[PDB]
Amino acid sequence: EDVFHPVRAKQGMVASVDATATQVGVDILKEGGNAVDAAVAVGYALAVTHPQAGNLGGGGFMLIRSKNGNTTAIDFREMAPAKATRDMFLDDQGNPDSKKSLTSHLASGTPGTVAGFSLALDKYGTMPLNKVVQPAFKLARDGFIVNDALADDLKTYGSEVLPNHENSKAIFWKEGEPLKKGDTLVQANLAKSLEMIAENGPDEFYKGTIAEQIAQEMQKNGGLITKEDLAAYKAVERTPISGDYRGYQVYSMPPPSSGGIHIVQILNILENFDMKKYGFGSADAMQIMAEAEKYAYADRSEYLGDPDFVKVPWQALTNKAYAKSIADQIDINKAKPSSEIRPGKLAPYE
Amino acid sequence: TTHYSVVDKDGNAVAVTYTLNTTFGTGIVAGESGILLNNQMDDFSAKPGVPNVYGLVGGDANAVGPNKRPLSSMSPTIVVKDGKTWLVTGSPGGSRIITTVLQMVVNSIDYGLNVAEATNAPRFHHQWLPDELRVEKGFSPDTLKLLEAKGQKVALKEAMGSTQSIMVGPDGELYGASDPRSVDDLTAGY
Numbered sequence: 001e002d003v004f005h006p007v008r009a010k011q012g013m014v015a016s017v018d019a020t021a022t023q024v025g026v027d028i029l030k031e032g033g034n035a036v037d038a039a040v041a042v043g044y045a046l047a048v049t050h051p052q053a054g055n056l057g058g059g060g061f062m063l064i065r066s067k068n069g070n071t072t073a074i075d076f077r078e079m080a081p082a083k084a085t086r087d088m089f090l091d092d093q094g095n096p097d098s099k100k101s102l103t104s105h106l107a108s109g110t111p112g113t114v115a116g117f118s119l120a121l122d123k124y125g126t127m128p129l130n131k132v133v134q135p136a137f138k139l140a141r142d143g144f145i146v147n148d149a150l151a152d153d154l155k156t157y158g159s160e161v162l163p164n165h166e167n168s169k170a171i172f173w174k175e176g177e178p179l180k181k182g183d184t185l186v187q188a189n190l191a192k193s194l195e196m197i198a199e200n201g202p203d204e205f206y207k208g209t210i211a212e213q214i215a216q217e218m219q220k221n222g223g224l225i226t227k228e229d230l231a232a233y234k235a236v237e238r239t240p241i242s243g244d245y246r247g248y249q250v251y252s253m254p255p256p257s258s259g260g261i262h263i264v265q266i267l268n269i270l271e272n273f274d275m276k277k278y279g280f281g282s283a284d285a286m287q288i289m290a291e292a293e294k295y296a297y298a299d300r301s302e303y304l305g306d307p308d309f310v311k312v313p314w315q316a317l318t319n320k321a322y323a324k325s326i327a328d329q330i331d332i333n334k335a336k337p338s339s340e341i342r343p344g345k346l347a348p349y350e
Numbered sequence: 351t352t353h354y355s356v357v358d359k360d361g362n363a364v365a366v367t368y369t370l371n372t373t374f375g376t377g378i379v380a381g382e383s384g385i386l387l388n389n390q391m392d393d394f395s396a397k398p399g400v401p402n403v404y405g406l407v408g409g410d411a412n413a414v415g416p417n418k419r420p421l422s423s424m425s426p427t428i429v430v431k432d433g434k435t436w437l438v439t440g441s442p443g444g445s446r447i448i449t450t451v452l453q454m455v456v457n458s459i460d461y462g463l464n465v466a467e468a469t470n471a472p473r474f475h476h477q478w479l480p481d482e483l484r485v486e487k488g489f490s491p492d493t494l495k496l497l498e499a500k501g502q503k504v505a506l507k508e509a510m511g512s513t514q515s516i517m518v519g520p521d522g523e524l525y526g527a528s529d530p531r532s533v534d535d536l537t538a539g540y
């Protein structure tokens with residue numbers, strides 16, 4: 001009957017971009033770990049098998065919902081360096097230099113992944129950090145086979161940055177070329193880092209050897225991340241943004257992410273239509289949705305920022321009254337140029 | 351970008367979206383740590399009115415500042431039905447993370463598609479600026495005439511996102527789906 005069928009399981013399940021990492025997640029669940037434990041193990045596993053995005057030197061968000069309904073969000077997003085400045089990415093003419101914000105040592109923010117994972121693990125997990133990091137440790141120490149995804153990413157995107165730095169090239173390049181499908185990727189240095197974290201906890205990263213290595217890498221190349229930055233970093237548990245769509249409650253990430261707010265905003269807008277009637281792929285459904293999104297991105301550019309620095313009008317943005325007023329400016333048989341759309345007037349919704 | 355979801359035997363659930371930002375970030379390994387460094391600083395508004403790598407714009411709210419966390423679009427998400435965790439999803443895609451998650455939710459609730467169907471369905475997206483109705487291959491030539499007609503400027507492009515989702519049956523049974531757009535991925539359980 002269906003053309004597409006979901007994978008089925010009766011006890012636990014993990015879905016991720018990498019087969020090895022997913023399997024790491026499942027094995028942890030089978031050992032009696034909880035969703036959070038598995039999630040941290042998967043996160044450390046990806047930092048090794050999916051260096052494209054999985055990481056220890058990046059950041060992100062996490063939404064946790066207990067079996068009892070308790071829903072919370074962990075913000076382990078990166079903090080700009082204390083010595084970071086407003087116009088730091090401007091050239092002499094005062095124009096944004098993409099190279100500076102994407103490839104130089106100035107593009108980096110103090111990483112929050114280790115922090116966020118440990119916060120979630122200590123408060124919501126049940127396994128010690130050393131146990132959930134072990135799978136990733138072995139993968140880095142003993143290596144793994146490069147698959148199509150990694151091989152393709154190394155060639156297409158890796159080529160533009162990895163071979164330009166000696167330590168990076170030594171790890172991901174082989175015989176003057178990016179590792180190919182079938183080659184083995186061993187990350188001895190990462191294994192040592194992982195091994196140290198599993199032993200001295202998250203401080204190994206923000207205060208220990210790893211912190212030193214990060215600070216020196218920046219200092220010797222014009223970066224700003226100092227040991228004070230790494231020591232002054234902290235993951236932050238925040239209240240999820242949520243809404244109600246046709247009787248279903250939706251929970252997502254609140255600022256610093258703009259994710260939560262706008263997904264809810266658009267759903268509120270859409271609620272004012274009989275979407276089901278139009279059906280998937282229909283001309284109408286695509287019409288309505290395309291327009292609703294416009295207003296959201298408009299508001300995004302204006303009202304969204306680190307809540308610890310700016311006040312976001314999230315109540316008004318997710319206010320159904322406002323959403324209903326946005327819905328009316330929508331014509332099922334005619335669009336509205338992004339030019340004739342500006343950040344909404346949240347006044348009567350404050 | 352990458353997102354993963356987990357649900358255990360007790361019904362606890364976690365959705366995580368994390369990244370270095372662009373693929374491999376700056377491509378700079380921090381000394382002998384073996385750790386690649388992110389280029390998340392580009393998510394800040396380098397200059398009010400000027401778009402970043404994803405075409406996203408900002409002002410003073412998202413301008414560069416010390417100890418400030420740059421604006422993100424990552425959306426690990428959880429939908430609840432009849433008071434119970436029902437859908438756990440999310441996806442990479444910079445600015446498209448928002449409309450990608452949105453379509454997963456709309457596909458599940460409004461069109462009654464199973465998590466695999468909802469995942470394999472074609473996607474579209476509009477971020478105000480640039481002004482265009484970005485689409486993926488998979489939408490009928492006919493339906494597309496109406497968008498161009500009704501007024502939209504359809505712009506076919508690269509596949510959007512990599513949803514990794516799990517749906518929870520009323521009886522505790524788990525249903526999952528990995529995105530066709532990402533190869534070598536996996537949704538497994540026991």
Ligand SMILES: *[C@](=O)([C]=[N+]=[N-])O[C][C]([N])C([O])=O
Pocket residue numbers: 351352369371372373393421422423424441442443444445447
């Ligand atoms: C990721 O989707 C990786 N890519 N391209 O970017 C996410 C972005 N940095 C965000 O919204 O935080």
